[PDB]
Every structure is written in structure tokens, then in C-alpha cells.
Design an enzyme around this catalytic site. Structure first.
Site, PDB file in Angstrom:
ATOM      1  N   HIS A  12       0.822  -1.197   0.000  1.00 42.51           N
ATOM      2  CA  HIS A  12       0.000   0.000   0.000  1.00 42.51           C
ATOM      3  C   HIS A  12       0.852   1.241   0.000  1.00 42.51           C
ATOM      4  CE1 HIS A  12      -2.106   3.152   2.517  1.00 42.51           C
ATOM      5  NE2 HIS A  12      -2.934   3.058   1.470  1.00 42.51           N
ATOM      6  N   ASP A  13       0.518   2.210  -0.851  1.00 43.47           N
ATOM      7  CA  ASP A  13       1.293   3.449  -0.937  1.00 43.47           C
ATOM      8  C   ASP A  13       2.770   3.112  -1.164  1.00 43.47           C
ATOM      9  OD1 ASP A  13      -0.337   5.847  -0.828  1.00 43.47           O
ATOM     10  OD2 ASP A  13      -0.876   5.309   1.216  1.00 43.47           O
ATOM     11  N   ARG A  44       0.786   5.947  -6.440  1.00 42.99           N
ATOM     12  CA  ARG A  44      -0.048   7.107  -6.422  1.00 42.99           C
ATOM     13  C   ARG A  44       0.705   8.250  -7.056  1.00 42.99           C
ATOM     14  NH1 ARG A  44      -3.692   6.595  -2.172  1.00 42.99           N
ATOM     15  NH2 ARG A  44      -3.583   4.367  -1.549  1.00 42.99           N
ATOM     16  N   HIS A  88       2.143  10.768  -1.816  1.00 48.11           N
ATOM     17  CA  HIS A  88       1.077  10.279  -0.854  1.00 48.11           C
ATOM     18  C   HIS A  88       0.245  11.520  -0.570  1.00 48.11           C
ATOM     19  CE1 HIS A  88      -1.020   9.002   2.823  1.00 48.11           C
ATOM     20  NE2 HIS A  88      -0.293   7.877   3.014  1.00 48.11           N
ATOM     21  N   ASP A 121       0.753  -2.566   4.569  1.00 44.23           N
ATOM     22  CA  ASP A 121       1.760  -1.598   4.916  1.00 44.23           C
ATOM     23  C   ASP A 121       3.015  -2.360   5.446  1.00 44.23           C
ATOM     24  OD1 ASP A 121       0.395   0.667   4.236  1.00 44.23           O
ATOM     25  OD2 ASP A 121      -0.356   1.090   6.241  1.00 44.23           O
TER      26      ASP A 121
HETATM   27  O1  LIG Z   1      -5.540   7.050   1.857  1.00 42.68           O
HETATM   28  C1  LIG Z   1      -6.669   6.304   1.405  1.00 42.68           C
HETATM   29  C2  LIG Z   1      -6.216   4.830   1.536  1.00 42.68           C
HETATM   30  O2  LIG Z   1      -4.834   4.867   1.132  1.00 42.68           O
HETATM   31  C3  LIG Z   1      -6.953   3.872   0.628  1.00 42.68           C
HETATM   32  O3  LIG Z   1      -6.330   2.590   0.644  1.00 42.68           O
HETATM   33  C4  LIG Z   1      -7.034   4.387  -0.805  1.00 42.68           C
HETATM   34  O4  LIG Z   1      -7.802   3.436  -1.525  1.00 42.68           O
HETATM   35  C5  LIG Z   1      -7.838   5.681  -0.721  1.00 42.68           C
HETATM   36  O5  LIG Z   1      -8.328   6.050  -2.039  1.00 42.68           O
HETATM   37  C6  LIG Z   1      -6.939   6.718  -0.042  1.00 42.68           C
HETATM   38  O6  LIG Z   1      -7.607   7.990  -0.045  1.00 42.68           O
END
Ligand SMILES: O[C@H]1[C@H](O)[C@@H](O)[C@H](O)[C@@H](O)[C@H]1O
Ligand SMILES: O[C@H]1[C@H](O)[C@@H](O)[C@H](O)[C@@H](O)[C@H]1O
Length: 305
Positions: free
Chosen positions: A30-31, A67, A80, A281
Site C-alpha cells: 500500500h502506498d 499514487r 502520498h 503496509d
Molecule cells: O488514503 C486512502 C487509503 O490509502 C486507501 O487505501 C485508498 O484506496 C484511498 O483512495 C486513499 O484515499
């Protein structure tokens, strides 16, 4: 005969490549790009990984949640939200290109989402910029999956990146959500929606604002559904990550340090059950004496061939 998780750099090579990517249990990050943050106060809420892209990939991560923010009409910076992550999208693309060359029987699924408002000077949409300066850029020729299969197998995608499109409607025609409707994504929710002109049913748990205990229940409820579902046309994406909150330092890391092992233990207790793609994460971050989420996702895949 060792566990797949003993070779995370090339675990997809040990699978039957006749499998649809949807039927593979895939660890994601994630991220993914946020490993470059060092500022301690910012990292509480904005940092979700300590490893770089090549090291995530060597530890067996195959889904990347990238992202972006459009920095110029020909440029996408990895972000982020408001926070610049200090590299542009070509950086992840070069790392993946390199990793896929060295491990040609792996595939990478790259989620692409707009995470913040474009720079003032930008005149193009984020999707146009991505489409023309990255996806159709001759510089990354052969790198992306450009097939027309809405449910591609490992054989047709390995050595390539498959787009998982969180840009909204797109004119790109290959990958998940690659149509002019894109993916209808519900905010902070468990949800289901058809994608690829109704060819696939996407089932998502993305309740990113949940507290510890609720989040674990949300991940376990979607894990329990995947376990009973053998339908290759259903795709499961289960986010274990959550936004930070509780005390001045109830960081994303603190949540991950509790969630990851708990879900890792549950998957291990489940044996070979289908999990779907679980997006976490601090992928690869271990704690003495607890189960490792990335390894348990990898090992939940049943080999037979
Ligand atoms: O921070 C949030 C979160 O990271 C979610 O996993 C993502 O799907 C969203 O769109 C984001 O706004
Ligand atoms: O990346 C992390 C980090 O280096 C920690 O300090 C170590 O204790 C963990 O086990 C490792 O997984």
C-alpha cells in the site's frame, strides 16, 4: 521441496502459468512509493513502507499501489496525497523493468491512481498524461501488458506490468478497469463492482479509516468470502493498511505491527485457501516471534503440477 516463501524473489515462477492472475494469492504494498520518507512526524501518517521497490519485489511483493501527481504535461511524480515522495513514475517503471528482466516469470500488477491536484502549469488530464507519456511512450515499449484478455493468465502477463486502473475512465484498453468507465471505487468501504465491461466482479475491502479491531474484522470477513469462492472471474483486493490515529504516534506502522501478524496467523491456520490479493503496509517488515504476512500470502498458494 521448500516453501514458496523461501524464494520470494521468484515465487510466481513456481506456479502453473495457466492460472488467471485473479486466482493467485498475491501480496501487494500500500502506498508503495513512500519508503523515501525520513521526516519522523510526517512518517507517522504518510509513510507506509521502509523498503524500496526492488527490495519489495525481492521480498515477493507483486502488486504495487502507485499514487501520482501530474507535475508537468509530460511528467508524473509519485506522491502520498499532498506529500512528494521524491521520485517520478519512471523510477518505479525502471525498477520493475529491471526486476522483470532478472525474473522473467513473474508479473507485476501496477495500480495507478491520481492522489493530488496537478501542478498549476499542467494543461492535460492525469489519465492523458499517463496514457501518452508512460503507457504509449516508446521508451517503455514491451514493458506493459497490452493484450486484450480481460482476465489474463500468468503466461500472458509474466515479464510485463499489468495496469490496475484507478484513474477513472481511460482510453487504455488492457488491464483491470481499462475501459471508459474505469473502476467505481467506494470510499472507506467493503464493496463489489463489475469491471472490464462486466467481465470481472471486483470485491474490495478498503475501509482505510477503521480502528484496529474493526479493520481486522473487515479483512477477515473478505478473507472468509475468498476462501469459499473458486470463481476465476471474481477478483479480491483486501487492504490491511489503515490511516494513522489514536495518540500523537498511533502511526500506520503501529497499526501494521498488529494487523499484519494477526492476519498472517489466520491465513496460516487456513492452509491452502484462496485469499485474493492482500495489500499491506510495511511489506517484509518482520517482528521476532510473529507470522509474516507476505510469506503467509505467498504460501497460501496451492501447487499441483
Ligand atoms: O488514503 C486512502 C487509503 O490509502 C486507501 O487505501 C485508498 O484506496 C484511498 O483512495 C486513499 O484515499
Ligand atoms: O525491515 C525490518 C527492519 O530492518 C527491522 O529493524 C528488523 O528488525 C525487521 O525484522 C526487518 O524486517
Amino acid at each position: 521441496s521448500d516453501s514458496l516463501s523461501k524464494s520470494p524473489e521468484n515465487w510466481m515462477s513456481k506456479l502453473d502459468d495457466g492460472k488467471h492472475l485473479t486466482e493467485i494469492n498475491i501480496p501487494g504494498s500500500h502506498d508503495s512509493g513512500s519508503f523515501t520518507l525520513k521526516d519522523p512526524v510526517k512518517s507517522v501518517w504518510a509513510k507506509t513502507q521502509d523498503k524500496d521497490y526492488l527490495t519489495q519485489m525481492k521480498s515477493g511483493v507483486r502488486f504495487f499501489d502507485i499514487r501520482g501527481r501530474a507535475s508537468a504535461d509530460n511528467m508524473i511524480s509519485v506522491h502520498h496525497g499532498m506529500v512528494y515522495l521524491h521520485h517520478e513514475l519512471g523510477k518505479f517503471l525502471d525498477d520493475a523493468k529491471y526486476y522483470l528482466s532478472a525474473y522473467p516469470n513473474e508479473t507485476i500488477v501496477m495500480s495507478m491512481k491520481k492522489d493530488y491536484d496537478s501542478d498549476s502549469k499542467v494543461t492535460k488530464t492525469f489519465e492523458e498524461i499517463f496514457r501518452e507519456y508512460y503507457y504509449n511512450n516508446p521508451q517503455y515499449q514491451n514493458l506493459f501488458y497490452t493484450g486484450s484478455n480481460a482476465n489474463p493468465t500468468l503466461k500472458e502477463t509474466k515479464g510485463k506490468i499489468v495496469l490496475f486502473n484507478r484513474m477513472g475512465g481511460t482510453y487504455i484498453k488492457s488491464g483491470y478497469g481499462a475501459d471508459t468507465s474505469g473502476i467505481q471505487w467506494a470510499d472507506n468501504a467493503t464493496f463489489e463492482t463489475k469491471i472490464n465491461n462486466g467481465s470481472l466482479n471486483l470485491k474490495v475491502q478498503d475501509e482505510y479509516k477503521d480502528y484496529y479491531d474493526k479493520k481486522v474484522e473487515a479483512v477477515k470477513n473478505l478473507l472468509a468470502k475468498a476462501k469459499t469462492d473458486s470463481n476465476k472471474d471474481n477478483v479480491y483486493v483486501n487492504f490491511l493498511s489503515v490511516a494513522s490515529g489514536g495518540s500523537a504516534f498511533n502511526s500506520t506502522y503501529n497499526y501494521a505491527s498488529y494487523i499484519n501478524p494477526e492476519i498472517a496467523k489466520t491465513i496460516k491456520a487456513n492452509g491452502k485457501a484462496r485469499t485474493g490479493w492482500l495489500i499491506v503496509d510495511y511489506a517484509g517488515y518482520t517482528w521476532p516471534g510473529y507470522d509474516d504476512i507476505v510469506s503467509e500470502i505467498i504460501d497460501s498458494n496451492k501447487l499441483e503440477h
